[PDB]
Amino acid sequence: LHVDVPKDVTRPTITTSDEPDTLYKRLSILVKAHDRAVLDSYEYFAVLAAKELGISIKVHEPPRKIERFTLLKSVHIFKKHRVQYEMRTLYRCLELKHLTGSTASVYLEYIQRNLPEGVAMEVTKTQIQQLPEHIKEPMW
């Protein structure tokens, strides 16, 4: 828009509660896809998004898995003649560190809502909390 621009855009209401926040020591995001190029583009979007919000991120590529199975090519007899099929799974692991519970929800929503078709995520949150108050003091 050249001349016609919003004046005071409405922004969502964020209210700070009195409950303490979760503390995630680690947060591993394992994305899976049949296509390597899609993971490269998603890895760029996720690393850029993390860096813009202040999150610390690292990336590595777990070894790919190829599952192969054999089928019978003909409809009837001709046993020795087969057709083989495979499904390839490729992985990109985004290991985040030192996240509060509010930072991990907004980030995961933003990147989960933009998860391309054919891509599956496996978030593995690792929370750190104090000891139970009963355990803190031995009681007989």
Binding site: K32, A33, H34, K65, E67, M87, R88, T89, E117, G118, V119, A120
Partner: peptide, 18 residues
């Protein structure tokens, strides 16, 4: 398929452990 032409359907149901 997967060389010159892609897949007509794209879902996560044939990925490993899905």
């Amino acid at each position: 398929i997967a060389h010159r032409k892609g897949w007509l359907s794209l879902h996560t149901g044939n990925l490993d452990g899905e």
